[PDB]
Amino acid sequence: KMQFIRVNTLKINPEVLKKRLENKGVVLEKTFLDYAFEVKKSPFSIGSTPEYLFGYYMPQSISSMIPPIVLNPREDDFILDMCAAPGGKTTHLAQLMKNKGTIVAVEISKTRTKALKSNINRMGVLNTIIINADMRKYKDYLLKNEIFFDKILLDAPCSGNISEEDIKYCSLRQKELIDIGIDLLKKDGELVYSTCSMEVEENEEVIKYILQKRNDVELIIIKANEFKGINIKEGYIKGTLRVFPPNEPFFIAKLRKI
Ligand SMILES: Nc1ncnc2c1ncn2[C@@H]1O[C@H](C[C@@H](N)CC[C@H](N)C(=O)O)[C@@H](O)[C@H]1O
């Protein structure tokens, strides 16, 4: 299985970090991103370097770096990260926003909220409000108070996080979450649905469900061609993307409230 790291441009320049790690015996390979590297060899556990501890990078699959790139938040945006822990994608969104605007990062589990806050503090992120709550109830609070967002990441839990039952259970949850995400989007706003599963029940089923359920949503077409070097192709709904082995299994789509 491949290992990659995302360089945290909040704190450090790609080439400064690259030189420092290569001088300690790390062998790094380019990526379709100037701030992400493939780790080819490491005398270090990569979550264990002083550089990691300083917030210089985040280890993560390259697949998992796509949803924030596709959502493409701007600097001053107001952003919801619906299912946020451990914060891989929350800190990615913050880096893309350069620590401007606001991310509301929501996490159901109390324990996982710990890991989320740790990642955020470690990566030096300042634009993020951590909510420990069930999104399905937290959204009434947001709706009552008219708190709509410019762009939303729904990076949903997946069957793999933990059978046919696992998949059916996750799919149902994902369908609940996405309807909620559309409800919380400003008119003309953008939601990315992603998940660590390439199973169609968690993928195009959830997309087909929301398109038939609602009249106020439009599929935005995403293209693979940008994502060089990644085993990524079009889903079975045009303009959706599925990532395959030997990349980490993943699915990404993008919607617009009309
Ligand atoms: N209703 C819910 N509200 C908030 N968080 C949830 C809810 N249901 C599941 N989750 C969380 O969804 C997360 C699943 C992860 N795949 C998210 C990864 C995260 N987006 C990252 O990039 O690092 C877990 O943290 C679950 O605790």
Curated annotation (Swiss-Prot):
GO terms classed as biological process: tRNA methylation
Catalytic activity: cytidine(48) in tRNA precursor + S-adenosyl-L-methionine = 5-methylcytidine(48) in tRNA precursor + S-adenosyl-L-homocysteine + H(+); cytidine(40) in tRNA precursor + S-adenosyl-L-methionine = 5-methylcytidine(40) in tRNA precursor + S-adenosyl-L-homocysteine + H(+)
Enzyme class: transferase
InterPro entries for this protein: MeTrfase_RsmB-F_NOP2_cat, MeTrfase_RsmB-F_NOP2_dom, Nop2p, RCMT, RsmB/NOL1/NOP2-like_CS, SAM-dependent_MTases_sf
Molecular function in Gene Ontology: RNA binding; tRNA (cytidine-5-)-methyltransferase activity
Active site: 196 (nucleophile)
Localization in the cell: Cytoplasm
Positions bound to S-adenosyl-L-methionine: 83-89, 107, 112, 134, 155, 161, 173
Annotated GO CC locations: cytoplasm
Protein keywords: Cytoplasm, Methyltransferase, RNA-binding, S-adenosyl-L-methionine, Transferase, tRNA processing
Keyword Cell membrane: no
EC number assigned by the record: 2.1.1.-
Role according to the record: Catalyzes AdoMet-dependent formation of m5C in tRNA. Cytidine residue at either position 40 or position 48 is likely to be methylated.
PANTHER family: NOP2 YEAST -RELATED NOL1/NOP2/FMU SUN DOMAIN-CONTAINING, TRNA (CYTOSINE(48)-C(5))-METHYLTRANSFERASE
Family note: Belongs to the class I-like SAM-binding methyltransferase superfamily. RsmB/NOP family.
Protein name: tRNA (cytosine(48)-C(5))-methyltransferase
Lineage of producing organism: Archaea, Methanobacteriati, Methanobacteriota, Methanomada group, Methanococci
